[PDB]
């Protein structure tokens, strides 16, 4: 059948000044010179590139990057140890141990998110009742050694105080959703 299919698909283009049109396209590349022309148009157009360290790609306040334990404006870690994020975590990155502090109000003696064992899905930010754990738009925390990448119990996730100026902004703009 392929023999007859070939015979007919070549008897479709079989009238002079059509065999010539197709011959010219093969003889002088026409489809290919339309490839080169487009490629040239893009060789001369402005470049969609970004010299990274100096300017960075667009993000959104919902962007999920480095996890940060938030604080209440008046100190006092926002993280009451409900363990909802430890429960909701799909990868079980967060290990929370709780102890009634001397003040009497519950708090987490151990709040260690394992960033390497963490999927950055933002479930912890949703599950936390008081917005205690949020993902700071950092996303730039590549560490030379794996042990540093395991974020310690409430000490490095407490560096969100530096990122609060941006985390509070993102929360004030996302809370409408």
């Amino acid at each position: 059948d392929d023999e007859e299919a070939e015979q007919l698909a070549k008897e479709i283009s079989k009238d002079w000044s059509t065999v010539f049109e197709r011959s010219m396209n093969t003889l002088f590349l026409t489809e290919m010179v339309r490839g080169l022309s487009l490629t040239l148009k893009y060789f001369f157009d402005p470049k969609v590139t970004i010299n990274y360290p100096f300017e960075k790609g667009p993000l959104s306040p919902r962007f999920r990057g480095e996890h940060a334990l938030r604080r209440y404006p008046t100190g006092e870690e926002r993280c009451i140890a409900c363990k909802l994020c430890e429960a909701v975590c799909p990868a079980q990155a967060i290990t929370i141990e709780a102890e009634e502090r001397e003040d009497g109000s519950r708090r987490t003696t151990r709040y260690d998110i394992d960033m390497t064992k963490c999927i950055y899905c933002g479930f912890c930010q949703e599950a936390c009742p008081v917005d205690a754990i949020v993902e700071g738009p950092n996303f730039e925390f590549a560490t030379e050694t794996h042990e540093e990448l395991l974020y310690d119990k409430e000490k490095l996730l407490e560096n969100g105080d530096r990122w609060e100026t941006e985390i509070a902004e993102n929360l004030r703009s996302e809370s409408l959703y």
Partner: protein, 101 residues
Amino acid sequence: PCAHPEYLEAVPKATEYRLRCPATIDEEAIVPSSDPETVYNIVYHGRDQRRNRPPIRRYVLTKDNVVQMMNEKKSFDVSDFPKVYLTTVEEDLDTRGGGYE
């Protein structure tokens, strides 16, 4: 002489795009949670979907039942047959809307 019929003039470089950066609340969104009829009327067993379903009726068929059914099925007249999902192919270039959707 290329793919530029006054239509590639929609070029990729936008230069005016996301003019209102996302975390800037010019308009405070509202994102309704519940329909207005279901704010002060929280009766649930009517609205329930998880548990508001008929129970599973798993009843056994013994040989008597199926021989009765086989004898009851006298003939397979048309419309006792599954309908075919008829789908043919038809050449079309840009006629749907005129290429503009």
